[PDB]
Amino acid sequence: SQIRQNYSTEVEAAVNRLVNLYLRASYTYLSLGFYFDRDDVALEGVCHFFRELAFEKFEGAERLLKMQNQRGGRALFQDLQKPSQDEWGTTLDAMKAAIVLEKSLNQALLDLHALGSAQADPHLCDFLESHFLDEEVKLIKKMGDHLTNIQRLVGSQAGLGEYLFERLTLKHD
Amino acid sequence: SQIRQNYSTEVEAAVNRLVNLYLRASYTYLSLGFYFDRDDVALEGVCHFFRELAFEKFEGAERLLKMQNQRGGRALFQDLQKPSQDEWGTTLDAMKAAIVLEKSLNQALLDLHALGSAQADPHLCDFLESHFLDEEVKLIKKMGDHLTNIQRLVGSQAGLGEYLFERLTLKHD
Amino acid sequence: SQIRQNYSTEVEAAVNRLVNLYLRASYTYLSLGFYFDRDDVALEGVCHFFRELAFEKFEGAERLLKMQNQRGGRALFQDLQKPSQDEWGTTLDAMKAAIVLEKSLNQALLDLHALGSAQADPHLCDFLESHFLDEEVKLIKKMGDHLTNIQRLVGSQAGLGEYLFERLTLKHD
Amino acid sequence: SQIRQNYSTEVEAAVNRLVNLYLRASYTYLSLGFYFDRDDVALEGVCHFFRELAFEKFEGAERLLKMQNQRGGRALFQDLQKPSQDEWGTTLDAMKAAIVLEKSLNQALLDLHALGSAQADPHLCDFLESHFLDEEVKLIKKMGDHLTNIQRLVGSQAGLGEYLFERLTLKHD
Ligand SMILES: CCN(CC)c1ccc2nc3c4ccccc4c(=O)cc-3oc2c1
Ligand SMILES: CCN(CC)c1ccc2nc3c4ccccc4c(=O)cc-3oc2c1
Ligand SMILES: [Cl-]
Ligand SMILES: [Cl-]
Ligand SMILES: [Cl-]
Ligand SMILES: [Cl-]
């Protein structure tokens, strides 16, 4: 490359792997969103929440791909694995699956940051810190807040609580 | 002092003591507010309510300190004791603790008013009447209204009631 | 915690310690500000400077507490020690005390950054770099600029210089 | 009187006496203001400060006279004694004379409040608290702040300090 400088093959490959993880996450959120749009589930605020996350994760992949090119690396795409489930259960089940997904992306970000630090690649480290690490922390905090409210609402009237959460916390429309 | 007039040492000291009580109250409300922002509590309206009170109590201390100087007294600061609890329980537990705190501040205001009356210090008495006594009465009334609504919502579904109170009465986002 | 990830007990505790240091600093600045509002000191620009810093340091504590919760740590509050002095001397004495205070906060920030680096906690490191380290450097530079101007103005006419500094450099109004 | 109620002859007379004191104070401030407008004194900000106070004290008398009539008492005017001096010295001398004057008015307000309290006349007490006591405290605090700044500026260059105070603290432009 005529521009590549201080950009290791290891980081280049890990970036491509992370693009795959973000596109898989986007796909998972597309599946979650449309599940909640089913006539027999019908929780608009939950659908909207997950569809928004599908877009956010795509944007994350886009930013990684832009940076790969800015650095002189080469984007390499792999097959995208389908989401882990076809049906996602209750809002609680779905929000738990989402927090599990987000922690896995966060760990991948942290692992890439550590590789960048080890390789003395401060542009990579700053890129992740400036556009991914705090965004992930903020999202996981939101999802934990949601889990706690969903859990408080289960009690002995689960359907009532699931409706009220979707109507009074989640944005709808 | 070149300006001090009709301002007793007893009032000056009690004013400094009251500044301590208001800053302690502000600190208590800072702790309450952040407790409700925990991911495992997650009641935004309750957090906002108490954080607002932390500011209001600081403002109270500020006004007392401004008046101390207007009168020619000397501000004296003491250590500020940490709040009485690290974890604040339910919204009900917290609102009960807040009403207890406010009654204690109110009693301190009333005690200072009585000292001012005894010392024939009408500026002090007017100051408390104009900026503190009715503010306290209004706040205690609001908190009692809240307690009654929180208590009516406990029934056999406590989590549901705690969510609904935070969503439909407390300001959030 | 359902959200805690890559957040050490050591960082959590140091964050709580730093909240204490920032609230102590806020309290010190509240005392400095009201000292300069005394009728026998009467330097409005100096009062305003320090009162503004009391708010800035509170805001710093607030940001730390928000982050503690975003990360899944638990805020723990301790007693707040009263400021080191009841009377703060001249503007020069006060500005020297403030630079000493700020260097101590800066060192605490640097120590926490180093702990975060050692623990491979890049979110913490970025948080401090983005919201605290440059703010501290900018403030210490301002205070040094002030010290130099205050010192140049002492000469053989200290009262004249103290008045002129407050009137022509410090904001009043 | 067809309207007089709970309004003692003692309060009525003391109100008339206080009108005299306020008009005497207004006259003193008129003399101070024009002294500072002399071509051989020439301190516009000091002149403006005292002329403003002449108006403020007249307004005070006007308010007392309005209240006397609201209560059913009868305004009675006495001779107004000329100010204590024809020439007022330095800005420092003048500001000291003004603080002495204001403390004397404040004491008269406090004495009237105490009479009203003794006579169970809460309208009178509220009137003084709402329109006079805090206004007096605020003005005496301002004058003390001014005295301190004037005194700090004397040093070994009195004319320089007197000019700088008038230019940088007092309103002119
Ligand atoms: C002295 C230590 N303590 C008591 C815990 C302070 C000090 C300063 C504070 N300043 C603010 C403040 C300042 C500007 C704008 C809003 C606020 C606010 O909402 C709450 C505050 O709370 C404070 C507590
Ligand atoms: C009764 C004799 N005395 C005392 C010396 C008065 C009478 C009337 C006065 N009327 C004004 C006045 C009227 C309108 C607008 C502004 C002003 C003012 O700035 C000061 C005054 O001062 C007064 C003193
Ligand atoms: Cl698969
Ligand atoms: Cl304690
Ligand atoms: Cl101490
Ligand atoms: Cl005479």
Numbering used by the authors:
A (entry chain A), B (entry chain A), C (entry chain A), D (entry chain A): 2 to 174
Paper quotes:
As a scaffold for aromatic cluster design, we chose ferritin as a protein cage platform with a 12 nm outer diameter and an 8 nm inner cavity, composed of 24 subunits. To prove this concept through protein engineering, we focused on a two‐fold symmetric inter‐subunit interface of a recombinant horse spleen apo‐L ferritin (Fr) as a target region for mutagenesis. Herein, we present the construction of an aromatic cluster with an artificial molecular binding pocket at the two‐fold symmetric interface of ferritin and explore its ligand‐binding characteristics. We developed a system that uses ligand binding as a driving force to induce and propagate changes in the orientation of multiple aromatic side chains.
Next, we replaced Glu residues located near residue 59 with Phe residues to form an aromatic cluster surrounding the Phe59 pocket. The resulting mutants were named Fr‐F2 (Fr‐E56F/R59F), Fr‐F4 (Fr‐R52F/E56F/R59F/E63F), and Fr‐F6 (Fr‐E53F/E56F/E57F/R59F/E60F/E63F), where i in Fr‐Fi represents the number of newly introduced Phe residues per ferritin monomer (upper). Analysis of the 2Fo‐Fc maps revealed electron densities corresponding to Nile Red (NR) at the two‐fold symmetric interfaces of NR•Fr‐F1, NR•Fr‐F2, NR•Fr‐F4, and NR•Fr‐F6, observed as overlapping densities due to the interface symmetry. NR was positioned between two F59 residues, forming π–π stacking interactions in an F59–NR–F59' configuration. Anion‐π interactions between NR and E60 in NR•Fr‐F1 and NR•Fr‐F2, and CH‐π interactions between NR and F60 in NR•Fr‐F6, were identified, indicating NR's stabilization in the F59–F59' pocket via multiple non‐covalent interactions. Notably, NR•Fr‐F1 and NR•Fr‐F2, containing only one and two Phe residues, respectively, achieve higher quantum yields (94 and 95%, respectively) and longer lifetimes (5.54 and 5.75 ns, respectively) than NR•Fr‐F6 with six Phe residues per monomer. The hydrophobic and polar nature of the protein surface around NR influences its fluorescence properties, with the partially polar microenvironment in Fr‐F1 and Fr‐F2, attributed to Glu residues near the pocket entrance, potentially enhancing fluorescence.
